[PDB]
From a paper:
Bacteriophage Casadabanvirus JBD30, from the order Caudoviricetes, is a temperate phage that infects the bacterium Pseudomonas aeruginosa. The virion of bacteriophage JBD30 is composed of an icosahedral capsid, long flexible non-contractile tail, and a baseplate. Using its baseplate, JBD30 attaches to Pseudomonas aeruginosa via the bacterial type IV pilus, whose subsequent retraction brings the phage to the bacterial cell surface.
The heads of tailed phages assemble as procapsids. The sample of JBD30 used for the collection of electron micrographs contained a fraction of procapsids, which enabled their structure determination. The procapsid of JBD30 has thicker walls and is more spherical than the mature capsid. The hexamers, built from the major capsid proteins, in the procapsid are compressed and skewed, as was observed in the procapsids of other phages. The diameter of the procapsid is 556 Å, which is 6.8% smaller than the diameter of the mature capsid (596 Å). Pores along the central axes of the pentamers (15 Å diameter) and hexamers (13 Å diameter) are wide enough to enable the escape of scaffolding proteins from the procapsid. No decoration proteins are present at the procapsid surface, since the binding sites for the minor capsid proteins are not formed because the arrangement of major capsid proteins differs from that of the mature head. The expansion of the procapsid into a mature capsid is enabled by conformational changes to the major capsid protein. During capsid maturation the N-terminal arm (residues 6–25), which is an α-helix in the procapsid, extends, unfolds, and rotates ~40° anti-clockwise.
Author numbering:
A (entry chain L): 54 to 103
B (entry chain a): 3 to 53
């Protein structure tokens, strides 16, 4: 858009009837624990992991 | 001349000395190592094999 000069006329916005179709997506991740170190009380792990 | 108080004072002085020394110790393992605390009989930690 830009300031337009009078010539005895009017100019409406130009662009119309168009799109881009971004088509948003999704992402994910997952981690495990192995259920073993819980008994050993080695809970020091999984702090820096998270 | 020699009393347990002097020994305790020397112990505290040495404690402060090497505590200050260790607090300023250069760190190089943290660049390529991961710190993991443990409490007792820690031999398995199953974050491996997960990518």
């Amino acid at each position: 858009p830009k300031l337009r000069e009078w010539i005895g006329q009017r100019v409406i916005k130009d662009m119309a009837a168009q799109g881009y179709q971004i088509t948003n997506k999704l992402f994910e991740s997952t981690v495990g624990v192995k259920r073993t170190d819980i008994e050993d009380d080695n809970l020091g792990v999984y702090g820096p992991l998270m | 001349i020699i009393t347990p108080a002097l020994i305790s004072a020397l112990k505290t002085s040495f404690q402060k000395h090497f505590q200050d020394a260790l607090a300023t110790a250069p760190s190089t393992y943290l660049q390529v190592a991961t710190v993991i605390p443990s409490t007792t009989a820690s031999n398995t930690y199953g974050w491996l094999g997960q990518f």
